[PDB]
Ligand SMILES: CCCCCCCCCCCCCCCCCC(=O)OC[C@H](COP(=O)([O-])OCC[N+](C)(C)C)OC(=O)CCCCCCCCCCCCCCCCC
């Protein structure tokens with residue numbers, strides 16, 4: 008149930024001693040290492056051609072946040088603040104009120120993307136699949152406050168990526 | 184004469200590239216920098232061992248200087264004496280290396 | 294039910310031991326080749 | 337007309353050093369299962385040009401130097417010596433055909449430690465000075481086996497003339513009578529140029545870290561000129577090619593292919609090994625290479641006498 | 651005019667040479683170092699863009715702040731930033747370097763590295779993937795490509 012790495016006694020007959028001396032004087036293991044490096048020289052490299060070739064992602068991937076809608080245009084978020092209660096970094100800021108048709112909707116849905124730990128506890132706390140963490144990972148900004156998303160930005164990310172988000176949820180909702 | 188021209192050309196091209204490398208980015212007006220090391224201000228502690236390896240280099244380099252006329256000395260007609268003195272010089276360099284060994288002179292830079 | 298499972302007979306065997314495949318001549322043979330190269334050069 | 341010959345020596349030196357950086361990045365790429373530069377030019381052929389233009393407009397690092405004069409002199413000396421090591425090289429005809437070209441190269445390479453020493457003292461960093469002293473001690477250590485191996489080989493040549501070394505190897509490569517000298521020579525040239533696994537100026541500060549991007553690039557290109565030069569010298573010395581005097585370009589193609597393969601062998605050794613500790617390559621020199629080198633020097637003195645194979649003087 | 655054309659072409663040349671030979675100094679502070687190492691790994695391979703792996707801080711062109719910046723190390727970050735030769739850029743990688751992140755309300759964390767150094771590219775994630783960091787590096791190259799140093803110099 009255990010083994011001994013490096014508890015070998017080398018043989019002391021003249022054959023093995025001359026083998027070790029040919030190793031010492033003729034650099035045999037150094038030629039072995041050069042052979043392995045030469046062997047990778049003639050392999051096809053593993054290098055993909057970014058940005059034209061992309062790293063393989065799964066439908067579970069946790070990238071940029073998006074507030075989703077129903078198939079009527081009504082936003083799914085009914086202001087229940089479960090996502091900001093579960094949010095481990097307190098990135099989500101929510102304020103709500105009844106709007107003009109009496110519906111329970113948010114007036115503030117902020118996510119600080121520089122507090123966010125991208126763990127997706129918000130999209131699994133969400134009872135109506137409103138907040139999701141979509142598939143976009145290429146959204147680097149030049150300014151810090153461009154990573155401070157309000158409700159308008161998140162609803163626009165939903166409208167932007169919904170054709171992809173719905174299919175990813177369609178792939179993974181039977182595991183959830 | 185061609186050697187002196189070649190040395191002057193190599194030295195002039197080196198000095199020209201060093202002048203360009205020290206004065207082409209001086210033309211920019213980048214910014215003044217205030218800018219207020221593993222040792223902070225401790226004086227450089229002397230190593231006896233670096234001096235000993237440099238002196239061992241110097242003495243073996245003198246023995247090499249003695250060894251350098253051997254490709255000419257093999258052409259002599261007193262070959263027994265020449266071979267004896269060549270083997271004696273390389274043997275005395277080997278005895279110098281052996282004494283440098285056995286009195287622990289080649290240690291911690293072995 | 295449909296769940297991520299191994300196949301019916303399981304997966305095949307997986308190598309996990311050391312394989313340094315022991316290549317090269319003997320020490321006697323390598324010193325013989327080196328001394329023979331020296332003798333050809335000297336001749 | 338001779339000045340044209342000097343320029344056609346030393347401008348292709350700078351171009352070959354420029355593209356050696358690309359070849360190193362590409363070959364080290366594919367040996368590390370990745371690619372090297374292939375975006376900047378087609379197949380990355382504009383990477384050295386882009387990098388030269390980047391380094392020559394980077395801000396000067398502006399050090400406080402202990403000496404301004406030696407801080408200027410160390411790149412000048414490095415580039416001058418790295419360009420003058422090429423002029424006796426018979427490929428098939430040297431620029432300067434001199435009778436003692438081997439000893440000339442050994443002397444001008446022995447002078448190359450002053451650039452390291454002067455740049456280390458010209459910096460105000462004491463740790464940079466310690467690194468410079470370690471690099472100088474390493475280089476002067478391996479110069480001993482350079483001189484003695486080189487003497488033991490030229491005992492088969494007859495003279496210090498580099499062009500005679502082609503005549504010496506017309507029937508056989510000189511690596512056949514002197515492969516132990518060749519392998520200790522090759523590792524000693526690997527340790528002269530501070531090349532991996534002997535690069536302790538990148539093992540955890542370099543002697544030339546206080547220089548700006550321009551002058552450090554000049555040190556870097558002097559180092560790669562030394563690398564290509566020592567590979568050409570090792571090719572001339574142990575792998576001497578066929579030379580038809582009516583068709584000199586056959587020798588030029590042949591030594592060029594062999595010197596390229598030997599420079600790529602430097603690139604392939606740095607893609608394979610960890611570094612030595614400093615005392616370990618001191619142990620490699622003083623306790624391993626130097627006793628074998630003295631023993632083989634005795635052997636290559638006594639061997640042309642005992643076989644009646646003393647080479648001619650002329 | 652002729653002078654505007656000449657300084658435009660020289661701007662294009664020097665911006666090409668700078669964005670095609672970016673040398674990074676990576677502050678491997680925390681978990682984002684692992685993903686910078688994956689951006690150097692053979693799948694993504696920053697070295698084919700001319701972006702070398704681990705240039706020394708006194709020759710690097712861009713400081714990738716990859717990890718959490720604590721209060722005990724913020725003067726070391728600023729000292730390495732002050733030792734970089736110009737033009738120097740700063741990529742902020744990941745949430746703790748961007749805004750404090752999961753340690754934003756901590757007593758010992760600098761709430762974003764932009765309180766310490768000026769920042770050019772904010773690369774979001776915890777960690778951002780190696781592909782997302784390589785996206786940020788290519789966006790930094792695009793930011794260098796549209797610089798107008800000599801055109802503004804000629805117009806001043
Ligand atoms: C010029 C073209 C290329 C030339 C060949 C080189 C290509 C291969 C290069 C591979 C990469 C090497 C990278 C650097 C390696 C550094 C480490 C290393 O190898 O250290 C050297 C190693 C050091 O060994 P070590 O340090 O591992 O050994 C332990 C030593 N002690 C116990 C002291 C700690 O070996 C040598 O020093 C040997 C040098 C060459 C010896 C050649 C001997 C030839 C045979 C002579 C005769 C033998 C029989 C007896 C007499 C018979 C008479 C009939």
Ligand SMILES: CCCCCCCCCCCCCCCCCC(=O)OC[C@H](COP(=O)(O)OCCN)OC(=O)CCCCCCCCCCCCCCCCC
Pocket residue numbers: 351377378381382
């Ligand atoms: C001993 C031999 C030594 C050889 C050393 C050199 C080796 C490498 C040789 C070069 C390899 C190919 C170079 C190709 C350069 C890129 C050309 C290009 O496509 O540039 C595009 C760019 C913008 O073009 P644009 O018109 O805007 O594109 C929109 C089109 N709808 O347009 C531009 O950028 C403007 C044009 C720039 C052209 C630069 C060309 C390369 C310069 C190489 C210098 C060395 C040449 C050889 C010297 C030795 C032989 C004499």
Ligand SMILES: CCCCCCCCCCCCCCCCCC(=O)OC[C@H](COP(=O)(O)OCCN)OC(=O)CCCCCCCCCCCCCCCCC
Pocket residue numbers: 354375376382384385386388389656659660662663666795
């Ligand atoms: C009077 C008018 C002239 C005034 C003075 C100017 C002198 C000539 C300077 C060079 C030519 C000017 C234009 C410079 C490039 C402008 C166009 C450009 O940037 O094109 C981009 C294109 C590659 O596109 P990229 O943005 O990199 O896209 C990434 C790939 N997805 O880029 C390319 O395709 C390659 C661009 C290469 C740039 C030219 C080649 C390098 C410079 C060679 C000459 C100088 C250096 C000589 C050697 C120095 C030492 C090695």
Ligand SMILES: CCCCCCCCCCCCCCCCCC(=O)OC[C@H](COP(=O)(O)OCCN)OC(=O)CCCCCCCCCCCCCCCCC
Pocket residue numbers: 184186187190194409412413416417420433434435436437440
């Ligand atoms: C800090 C200062 C600056 C540092 C950077 C620059 C200096 C360092 C780099 C250059 C070094 C210069 C070396 C000059 C002499 C080299 C030795 C030499 O001349 O060997 C070649 C050759 C000997 O061979 P052989 O064939 O026998 O002679 C011709 C007979 N047919 O002999 C000949 O061909 C003889 C040719 C005529 C005599 C040439 C004399 C040269 C000028 C004097 C020395 C110049 C260097 C002084 C400074 C040294 C370094 C500080």
Ligand SMILES: CCCCCCCCCCC1=C(C)C(=O)C(OC)=C(OC)C1=O
Pocket residue numbers: 200350353354355357358384385387388391552553556557702709
């Ligand atoms: C006269 C000037 C000729 C061009 C300059 C030398 C050729 C370009 C080398 C660029 C370079 C590379 C690739 C490089 O990787 C490197 O870092 C180790 C350098 O040192 C700072 C370099 O200089």
Ligand code: SF4
Pocket residue numbers: 090093094095096097098099118122123124125126127128129130140
């Ligand atoms: S992914 Fe996690 S840290 Fe980010 S908003 Fe959702 S719950 Fe908060």
Ligand code: SF4
Pocket residue numbers: 083084085086087088089090091101129132133134135136137138
């Ligand atoms: S996004 Fe979901 S969890 Fe958050 S307040 Fe809206 S409905 Fe509730």
Ligand code: SF4
Pocket residue numbers: 680681682683716717718743744745746747751752775776777778
């Ligand atoms: S942004 Fe996240 S993964 Fe990155 S260093 Fe911070 S805690 Fe670690």
